[PDB]
Structure formats: C-alpha cells, structure tokens
Amino acid sequence: QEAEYTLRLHHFFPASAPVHQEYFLPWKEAIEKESDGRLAVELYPSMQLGGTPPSLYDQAKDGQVDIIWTVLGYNSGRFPRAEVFDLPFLPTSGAATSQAAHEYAMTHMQDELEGVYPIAVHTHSPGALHTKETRIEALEDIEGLKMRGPSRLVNRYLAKLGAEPIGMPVAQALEALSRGVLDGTVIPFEAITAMGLADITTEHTIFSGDRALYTTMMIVAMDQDKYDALPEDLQPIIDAHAGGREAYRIGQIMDQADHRQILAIQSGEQPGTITRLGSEETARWQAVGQEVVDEWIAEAEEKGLDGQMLYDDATRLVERYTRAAAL
C-alpha cells in the first residue's frame, strides 16, 4: 500500500555506524513490511535534516522530525534521574545495562521523558582508558594525566583518581590530543576509531570482572504526538518494535562493535596495546568509584531526589538483566 504516514528518523552518526546498519535499517524494514507499506520510515544520519546534536531531543518532541537517536547528556543536567547510569563501574555489558536503563526509565523517568514515546532507552558499550603514551597498569599511572571525560560524573571520577579532567566539546578532542593539551580520553573503542584517534591514543586499559568503567544513557525517541496520531491498527506495529528487548539489541550491537575493535588491536590489524588490570587492582579503582557514588547519592538527596533508592534500583536492574543474559 501507499504510505499513510512517513516517519523521519534523525541522528548525528554516519550511515556506516553499527547501530544505523544493524538496527535502524532492519527497524525501517520491519515497520514498513508489517504495516503493509502504510508506514514509511526515512533514515537521516549525519544531521542531514539540520541542527546540531544537542537539538535532537527537541526536534522529536516538537514534531520537526518524528524519531531521533541521541545522548541524553548532550543536554547536561536535563535528565537528572538518568545521570545515575553515568556512575563509575555501574555497567556490565552495553546489552544488559541497556535493558536495565530502559526498565529504570519506564519506572522513574516518566516526567523526565514526558512528550516522547521511548522506542528504546539504552546505553552505549562501556568505555575504556585511551592514552597517547602512558601504559596504565595501576591506579598510580593515571595521576597527573590530562584526560577528557565524556560526562560530569566521569570527570569527577578522574579527579578522584588524581588525573586532571579537562572538559571540552568532542570536536576539540583529536586536536587537543595532537596539540598535547590532553594525554588521553575516556570513551568506547568504537568511538576512538570513528574519531580518527586509533593511531594517536595507542595505549588502552580495560578492567577485570563483571563491571566496566562507565557508560551513559541514550534514547531512540519518537514524538509522542506523532505516535498518538497513528491509527489504532498501526500503533501496535511500533509497540512490537519498542521496549527493553530493543534496548538490549542496540546495546548488543554496540558491544559487538567494540569487541571487533579490540580484536583488531589484539591481532595487530590495528596498532597499539590493550592492558587488562587484574582483580585486585580493579578493586582499588572500584573503591574510588564508590566515593563518586556516595557523593552523587548525597547531592541527589540535597536536591530532593531519593538518590539512594535510585542507585539501588539501577544496580538491582543491571544485576537482573546481566544474570538473565548469562543464563
């Protein structure tokens, strides 16, 4: 059939992005086929419909476009309950942490996400430590390093570890590293390569055990008004391709992409070194992490949020979905 509704999906990443190739393309297919063509989905990567990434959330909410994919934290401070997912050593895999974020958001973020229909609230694959020169084999080795963290809480963690955290827009990264304003940065492996950093930051440190350094919360968000305008027999087609199992899948795609990057470095296909810290060393980093958690909880309480309850629920959910997947 001819399209009754055309859903324009807008995001910042290139069409070659794993999520675009492996999630949005099949999402588009399923929506179109299951609606018998009544729903068309048009994909616009690389900000091809205009603006910059901090404007995406409002582009969907305001109905300029129908669906967006974005980082909540691009509007820093806008989603204060979501920030719990930025804490050090909270996440496990992108897949399981994603499923946990979705459920957390459905429980706690109904007002924070008012006006969007959440196709998937998820996280990216957990990040790692990337430096030009310093092989980080112990906590002591990060002391004094100029490191760009990708969130407030990761920068706070960096400062507790004794690094000097430096805030700047993401586009300034490659160049601040090359200019020597920065020693390194904290981001996933897929982001290192896509940013043109794979030959600049050739030392990479990851950790032992069933928790990883950090992630942040992302969303595939539809204008609630557009969802509400769809007929009763088409809304369920969207519902069938929305929710926590979609979030899991997005996270898993991002996990697979980061794993391929690690394999490439380990094989020699890409240059550099991957250092994994042992268990006991990793515990020292987690102990510092716990200080950031405790500070976040206190600050949240001071502002009227039940921070302890939220942290406890985020961590409960991460454990739930990690265990379910391991089985």
Instruction: Detail the residues annotated as belonging to a binding site for Mg(2+).
Output: 61, 223, 225
Contact of 272 with 130, CB cutoff 8 Å:
no
- Residue of 204, 51, 82, 57 whose CA lies nearest to 152: 82
Q: Are strands 184-187 and 146-148 parallel, antiparallel or unpaired?
A: parallel
Contacting range for Mg ion; rule: CB under 5 A; set: 56-64, 121-129, 141-149, 288-296: 56-64
Q: Which is nearest to 60 in space by CA: 186, 211, 220, 189?
A: 220
Cβ-based nearer residue to Mg ion, 223 or 246: 223
Eight-state DSSP code of residue 28: H
Among the residue ranges 57-65, 122-130, 163-171, 316-324, the one whose residues contact Mg ion (CB under 5 A)? 57-65
The CA distance from 298 to 251, in Å, is 30
By the rule CB under 5 A, 66 interacts with Mg ion? no
Based on CB atoms, which residue is closest to Mg ion, 223 or 258? 223
Nearer to Mg ion, 95 or 109 (CB): 109
What tokens does 60 get?
Answer: 């969907």
Structure tokens at 245: 């199992």
For Mg ion, the closer of residues 63 and 162 by Cβ is 63
Shortest distance, position 226 Cβ to Mg ion, whole Å: 7
Helix or strand or coil: residue 151?
coil
Min dist CB 101 to Mg ion, Å, is 22
Q: With binding defined as CB under 5 A, does residue 281 bind Mg ion?
A: no
- State the nearest-atom distance from the C-beta of 98 to Mg ion, in Å: 25
**Which positions make up the binding site?**
61, 223, 225
Q: Does 223 bind Mg ion (CB under 5 A)?
A: yes
42 binds Mg ion (CB under 5 A): no
Phi, psi dihedrals of residue 61, rounded to the nearest 5°: -55, -40
Minimum CB distance to Mg ion smaller for 68 or for 254: 68
72 vs 85, 112, 162, CA distance in Å?
11, 10, 27
CB of 221 to Mg ion, least distance (A): 10
In DSSP terms, which residues pair with 184 in a beta bridge? Answer: 131, 147
Of 55-63, 159-167, 211-219, 284-292, which part binds Mg ion (CB under 5 A)? Answer: 55-63
Shortest Å, Cβ 260 to Mg ion: 37
What is the rounded distance in angstroms from the CA atom of residue 168 to the CA atom of residue 175?
A: 11
| Per-residue DSSP letter, 267 | H
> What is the pairing mode between strands 116-123 and 217-223?
antiparallel
Binding part of the chain for Mg ion, among 154-162, 216-224, 253-261, 295-303 by CB under 5 A, reads: 216-224
CB of 327 to Mg ion, least distance (A): 40
If the CB atoms of residues 200 and 242 are measured against Mg ion, the closer one turns out to be: 242
Strand order in the sheet with 164-165: 164-165, 146-148, 184-187, 128-131, 203-206, 273-276
Q: Tokens 């919360």 map to which residue?
A: 217
Check residue 225 for interaction with Mg ion (CB under 5 A). yes
Three-state secondary structure call for residue 261: helix
| Contact window for Mg ion (CB under 5 A) among 63-71, 100-108, 174-182, 311-319 | 63-71
Output the smallest distance, CB 77 to Mg ion, in A.
21
| Minimum CB distance to Mg ion smaller for 210 or for 225 | 225
Which residues contribute to the site for Mg ion (CB under 5 A)?
Answer: 61, 63, 223, 225
